[PDB]
Amino acid sequence: ARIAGINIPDHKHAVIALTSIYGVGKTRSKAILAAAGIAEDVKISELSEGQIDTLRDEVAKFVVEGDLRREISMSIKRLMDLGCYRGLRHRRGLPVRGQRTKTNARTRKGPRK
Amino acid sequence: RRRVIGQRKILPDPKFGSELLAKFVNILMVDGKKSTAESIVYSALETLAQRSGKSELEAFEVALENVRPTVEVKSRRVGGSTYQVPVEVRPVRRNALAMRWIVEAARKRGDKSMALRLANELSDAAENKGTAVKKREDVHRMAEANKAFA
Amino acid sequence: RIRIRLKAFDHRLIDQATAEIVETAKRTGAQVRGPIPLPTRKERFTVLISPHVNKDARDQYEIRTHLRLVDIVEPTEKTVDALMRLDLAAGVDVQISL
């Protein structure tokens, strides 16, 4: 139950359901299935509760479960005091890539800035 | 102007058979992959034969009998007077015009699968149940009065 | 033991140079393999058609670079000693290999 975490899909095999959740995408889905010892062909019923979710350290090769996102806004609360460009661009409402002012901003400030 | 090259005479096919079936597998060709329509030609008929007609032998005859254009409409002017005018269509390609109006709608509608997008279109064509045909007829009906001229 | 190469930019000039090679290297010793034509490395050489304000049209020139190997089988350095001295007119390049 709830193999897809926050999301609803469950009538689906782990290789398309144990994906796009908790800091993992899809790049290692076959490898964790091969740790459990399961074939990628034919549908499964002999997989127990929490079984493949017990092997997640085969795919946790990332800042999973917000290991960085639980700090990023506080790292920015220090960055936004810095007398440098990357700090200035975090304490005045200014872009850092794209958003060329020679084009329309649509609703970012509304008609006539 | 008057020349213009002589319009083409098309072809039949040694497997698909008639000139119209040889047109069906060649019309509305996009991306040029040329293997998609040979699984869709005379393959939407077995369910049509139990939905909007009978047999796989008459399921496509009746579709091009229910979809039957007999008149075209176009503007015509003579100096400071303009009319919408009706003209009778020539019979020799008449069923190929009707064929085109079905196979394009399976592309311009995007609902479920291609194994449905044409079969679902044909089951209304074999009944003359096309989109917005009441307002289409309302133009030809209005233009009928202009066969009496000014 | 050794072999030769001949290069030119014209089909009639490389024949006019082949006529000298067969006469300069292939009569003593007498050598009988005839000249294969080989590819001409056909290409278009292109530049803008006008020097000002046009970039849409290009001027078309035909470039070819002809090759003849002519073939020699006599192993002696004497086979080329006269070819490294005689004409061979202007417009062609000869090369002695191995």
């Binding site: - | - | 930019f9 014209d10 278009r44 050489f45 530049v47 803008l48 020097p51 001027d59 078309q60 020139y61 035909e62 470039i63 070819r64 670079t65 417009g91």
Partner: protein
């Protein structure tokens, strides 16, 4: 365009001969501590870091009849805007015309 380029060429060809064109394979041994026990590279590194003007950057060769930044035919050396009177008159060997 101006005729300004030779007053740079005369200093920048020598700048390249001394500090670029014969300094490229040097990079594969100048910083290697295992490939030398002799002290030979430290001093020429201090010389190689002396110039700060051009060589691979800030400097383009440009055509000879006019110092235009582009139009130089690499395997011919001529400008494509100062060649037509020679090209048409058959003055470049191997080029043919017309219609193909």
């Amino acid at each position: 365009a101006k005729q300004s380029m030779k007053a740079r060429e005369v200093k920048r060809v020598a700048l390249a001969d001394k500090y670029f064109a014969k300094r490229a394979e040097l990079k594969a041994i100048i910083s290697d501590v295992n490939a030398s026990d002799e002290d030979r590279w430290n001093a020429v590194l201090k010389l190689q870091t002396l110039p700060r003007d051009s060589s691979p950057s800030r400097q383009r060769n440009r055509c000879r009849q006019t110092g235009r930044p582009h139009g130089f035919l690499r395997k011919f050396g001529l400008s494509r805007i100062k060649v037509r009177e020679a090209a048409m008159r058959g003055e470049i060997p191997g080029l043919k015309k017309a219609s193909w």
